């Protein structure tokens, strides 16, 4: 049933290696039985039930076996099972290359699209047979069988190239070693939870919890400069040898199917478009921050030149990338008397995951029940399950994996376990959602203190985990965050914005000690702060688009050259010799190959959406909550990305809010 929890969630993390890999052999003889079912029909007898039915069905049953083989290699704390998921998710990536190849399965979906009365059938049945073509023809399947053989073993090295690329900087366990002179600056609370070594040195990883707060806060800049170093040469021999046989690849590939560039490739199933309109939308956007970029550049020269008088330090008269986010910590104390280090205080996990959690009941007529003894992966995590609040109906669960261990995936980020679709049965299946992130655990009496950043973060990703459960869709291909890769980023960076708003910060803080709440002076400055080094941050993530487009168009060219270039061009902070960033690029391989753009892309759609409709008439209106979950979330990927904007906006969108939001004009 659709108003009820038991029997919907049907994910178990018992599993042994042995048992992952039985269940992965056996869910593929399940799964190809279909398509072979599929592909024996006759030309003539194909119809809905038994040829596009079938894989539909078929499809939300791999879907969903797949996530219990696939997702143990991201949070299981056993070794043996992570890498018997790695295996299991190679082995299935080339599965799936397998069937989406299939010639026979596509001759009798192009058939039944030019015999069938496409009127009769679902608005999504069309949408699912004009995407399902649109891929065959992607996967070269129209080329002679000697080309689509070529573009199949190519395929299959590539994904596992992708795979090895992150699983190198998962696995990577990379530290250096310190004397409590050389971490100067840093507090007793960093320091004392740090491993101690021999000779009395102190350990630091290259993780997120460990390279930012040095980065940012060590005021001794030969230890900047040697955690930069170190930082951004991780897998630096083995990611380079796999970037100079994956990205040529990914243009042979390209070229076969007939396309330019692997760019132009992946830009079609965007709502950007074509590179050309990336190209433009980049090169404009960098004109307009160009000259805070040169402000900010002057203020933090000048601010180090002080300092290194001050500290009686060697002055290079230059801006490294090791004293960046220092110098940029450092503008935001200065201008906005903001400490994050006291700001942290005022908001414990516990206080900020309630103040989240009430924030998008009310807004999106939502109600969230945690389970109790629920059966998780880890200890730590928690499930909560998601309900309509006028209905009653249940959307569905999420996960919450919020706490650094040996293991577990570096980065923030939302996992799709469920999609939130039709089943052969008739009835909606339950979508699961993880939110995995990375905050401090509680020590002694200590709970866990969370800088505003890793809040908006957790806002962040929590604006995908409402993405996925409050998406209902017909087919599974379709279903939660299954939706554009630029479009992708507008629900969780839509949520951002509740962490730059005054009443909602005071609503998400609370002392640890004393219960006190944050000064009414204190929340001016932090809700000010939103523009502190927005420049330089935001030219930033304009050289990683560039980079992204450069190296999926003009692939005989050198990675770290390429990124050395557009640092110093666009961000004026050059990329220091022998370091290597794109061996680190984590997206390159994740799926946002050329389309890391999709963020900023992604940002002019959230800005223009929450400045127009959610600042106009308050940020907590529960209408204007539930047109924003209707007409952005409830679809998935089962409309386009331009045309769900278009009927919440009731308009084409426009960079005005998103150039406000900076401190522009157009
Ligand atoms: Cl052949
Ligand atoms: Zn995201």
């Known amino acids: 049933?659709?108003?009820?929890?038991?029997?919907?969630?049907?994910?178990?993390?018992?599993?042994?290696?042995?048992?992952?890999?039985?269940?992965?052999?056996?869910?593929?003889?399940?799964?190809?039985?279909?398509?072979?079912?599929?592909?024996?029909?006759?030309?003539?007898?194909?119809?809905?039930?038994?040829?596009?039915?079938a894989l539909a069905d078929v499809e939300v049953k791999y879907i969903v076996e797949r996530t219990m083989l696939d997702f143990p290699q991201?949070?299981?704390?056993?070794?043996?099972?992570?890498?018997?998921?790695?295996?299991?998710?190679?082995?299935?990536?080339?599965?799936?290359?397998?069937?989406?190849?299939?010639?026979?399965?596509?001759?009798?979906?192009?058939?039944?699209?030019?015999?069938?009365?496409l009127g009769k059938i679902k608005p999504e049945a069309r949408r699912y047979l004009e995407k399902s073509i649109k891929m065959?023809?992607?996967?070269?399947?129209?080329?002679?069988?000697?080309?689509?053989?070529?573009?199949?073993?190519?395929?299959?090295?590539?994904?596992?190239?992708?795979?090895?690329?992150?699983?190198?900087?998962?696995?990577?366990?990379?530290?250096?070693?310190?004397?409590?002179?050389?971490?100067?600056?840093?507090?007793?609370?960093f320091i004392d939870s740090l491993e101690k070594t021999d000779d009395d040195k102190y350990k630091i990883t290259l993780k997120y919890p460990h390279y930012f707060p040095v980065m940012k806060k060590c005021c001794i800049p030969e230890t900047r400069r040697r955690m930069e170093m170190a930082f951004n040469t991780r897998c630096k021999e083995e990611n380079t040898i796999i970037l100079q046989q994956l990205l040529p690849l990914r243009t042979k590939v390209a070229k076969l199917?007939?396309?330019?560039?692997?760019?132009?490739?992946?830009?079609?199933?965007?709502?950007?478009?074509?590179?050309?309109?990336?190209?433009?939308?980049?090169?404009?956007?960098?004109?307009?921050?160009?000259?805070?970029?040169?402000?900010?550049?002057?203020?933090?020269?000048?601010?180090?030149?002080?300092?290194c008088k001050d500290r009686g330090f060697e002055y290079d008269g230059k801006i490294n990338a090791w004293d960046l986010y220092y110098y940029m910590t450092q503008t935001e104390e200065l201008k906005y008397s903001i400490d994050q280090e006291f700001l942290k205080e005022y908001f414990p996990i516990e206080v900020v995951t309630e103040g989240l959690l009430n924030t998008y009941q009310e807004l999106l007529g939502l109600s969230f029940?945690?389970?109790?003894?629920?059966?998780?992966?880890?200890?730590?995590?928690?499930?909560?399950?998601?309900?309509?609040?006028?209905?009653?109906?249940?959307?569905?669960?999420?996960?919450?994996?919020?706490?650094?261990?040996?293991?577990?995936?570096?980065?923030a980020a939302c996992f799709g376990l469920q999609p939130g679709c039709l089943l052969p049965d008739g009835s909606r299946m339950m979508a699961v959602a993880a939110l995995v992130v990375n905050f401090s655990q509680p020590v002694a009496g200590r709970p866990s203190l969370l800088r505003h950043d890793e809040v908006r973060t957790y806002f962040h990703q929590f604006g995908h985990v409402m993405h996925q459960i409050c998406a209902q869709t017909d087919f599974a291909r379709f279903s939660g965050t299954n939706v554009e890769t630029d479009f992708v980023e507008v629900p969780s960076q839509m949520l951002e914005n509740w962490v730059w708003d005054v009443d909602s910060l005071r609503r998400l803080s609370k002392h640890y000690k004393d219960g006190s709440p944050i000064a009414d002076d204190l929340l001016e400055k932090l809700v000010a702060s939103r523009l502190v080094n927005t420049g330089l941050l935001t030219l930033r993530q304009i050289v990683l688009s560039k980079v992204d487009q450069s190296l999926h168009?003009?692939?005989?060219?050198?990675?770290?050259?390429?990124?050395?270039?557009?640092?110093?061009?666009?961000?004026?902070?050059?990329?220091?010799?022998?370091?290597?960033?794109?061996?680190?690029?984590?997206?390159?391989?994740?799926?946002?190959?050329?389309?890391?753009?999709?963020?900023?892309?992604?940002?002019?759609?959230?800005?223009?959406?929450?400045?127009?409709?959610?600042?106009?008439?308050?940020?907590?209106?529960?209408?204007?909550?539930?047109?924003?979950?209707?007409?952005?979330?409830?679809?998935?990927?089962?409309?386009?990305?331009?045309?769900?904007?278009?009927?919440?906006?009731?308009?084409?969108?426009?960079?005005?809010?998103?150039?406000?939001?900076?401190?522009?004009?157009?």
């Open 1 to 53: 049933s659709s108003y009820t929890v038991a029997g919907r969630n049907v994910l178990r993390w018992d599993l042994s290696p042995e048992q992952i890999k039985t269940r992965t052999e056996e869910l593929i003889v399940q799964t190809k039985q279909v398509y072979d079912a599929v592909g024996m029909l006759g030309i003539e007898e194909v119809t809905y039930e038994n040829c596009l039915q």
């Open 74 to 117: 991201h949070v299981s704390s056993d070794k043996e099972v992570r890498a018997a998921s790695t295996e299991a998710d190679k082995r299935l990536s080339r599965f799936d290359i397998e069937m989406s190849m299939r010639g026979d399965i596509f001759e009798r979906i192009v058939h039944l699209q030019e015999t069938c009365d």
């Open 257 to 307: 199917l007939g396309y330019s560039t692997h760019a132009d490739f992946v830009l079609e199933m965007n709502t950007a478009k074509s590179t050309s309109r990336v190209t433009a939308f980049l090169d404009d956007l960098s004109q307009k921050l160009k000259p805070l970029g040169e402000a900010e550049r002057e203020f933090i020269l000048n601010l180090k030149k002080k300092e």
């Open 136 to 189: 065959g023809k992607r996967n070269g399947l129209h080329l002679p069988e000697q080309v689509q053989n070529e573009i199949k073993s190519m395929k299959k090295r590539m994904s596992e190239l992708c795979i090895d690329f992150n699983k190198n900087l998962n696995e990577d366990d990379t530290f250096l070693v310190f004397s409590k002179a050389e971490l100067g600056a840093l507090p007793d609370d």
């Open 553 to 666: 168009t003009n692939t005989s060219l050198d990675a770290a050259s390429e990124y050395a270039k557009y640092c110093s061009e666009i961000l004026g902070v050059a990329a220091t010799p022998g370091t290597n960033m794109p061996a680190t690029f984590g997206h390159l391989a994740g799926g946002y190959d050329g389309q890391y753009y999709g963020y900023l892309w992604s940002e002019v759609f959230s800005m223009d959406m929450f400045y127009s409709c959610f600042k106009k008439e308050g940020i907590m209106n529960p209408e204007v909550g539930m047109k924003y979950r209707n007409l952005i979330l409830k679809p998935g990927g089962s409309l386009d990305g331009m045309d769900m904007l278009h009927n919440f906006l009731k308009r084409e969108p426009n960079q005005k809010a998103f150039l406000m939001s900076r401190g522009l004009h157009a």
């Open 369 to 411: 029940e945690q389970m109790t003894d629920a059966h998780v992966w880890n200890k730590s995590v928690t499930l909560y399950t998601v309900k309509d609040k006028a209905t009653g109906e249940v959307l569905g669960q999420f996960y919450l994996d919020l706490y650094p261990r040996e293991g577990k995936y570096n980065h």
